[PDB]
Symmetry: C2
């Protein structure tokens, strides 16, 4: 996402407010302290790790139990 007000004033981090249905178009940026800045226009993954971690747990746990 992008806007001119983001480069034109003081900001490093920003909180993004959105509607899941509208993520493809318009979001609204807020400062870390809650002040509205402007809106910005738009110009299984980690579960594999979770599962692999689960197996590497269970096998090691049974092996430690015996």
């Amino acid at each position: 996402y992008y806007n001119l007000a983001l480069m034109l004033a003081g900001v490093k981090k920003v909180v993004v407010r959105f509607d899941p249905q509208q993520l493809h178009s318009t979001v609204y940026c807020y400062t870390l302290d809650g002040r509205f800045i402007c809106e910005a226009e738009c110009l299984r993954e980690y579960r594999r790790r979770q599962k692999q971690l689960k197996s590497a747990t269970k096998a090691a746990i049974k092996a430690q139990k015996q």
Copy 2:
């Protein structure tokens, strides 16, 4: 442990009967089917693995939960 009767007849595997207090001296060998053969004279470890396995479980589990 050792005995002459062990090399002098048919055996591959043997069940050892013992008294924890007498392990340093005399044990009694039995066949896999329970027949007494003779006695034999005597001529933290895995917990480190268990603990390491425990840590590698817990860290991965919290990481999968978040």
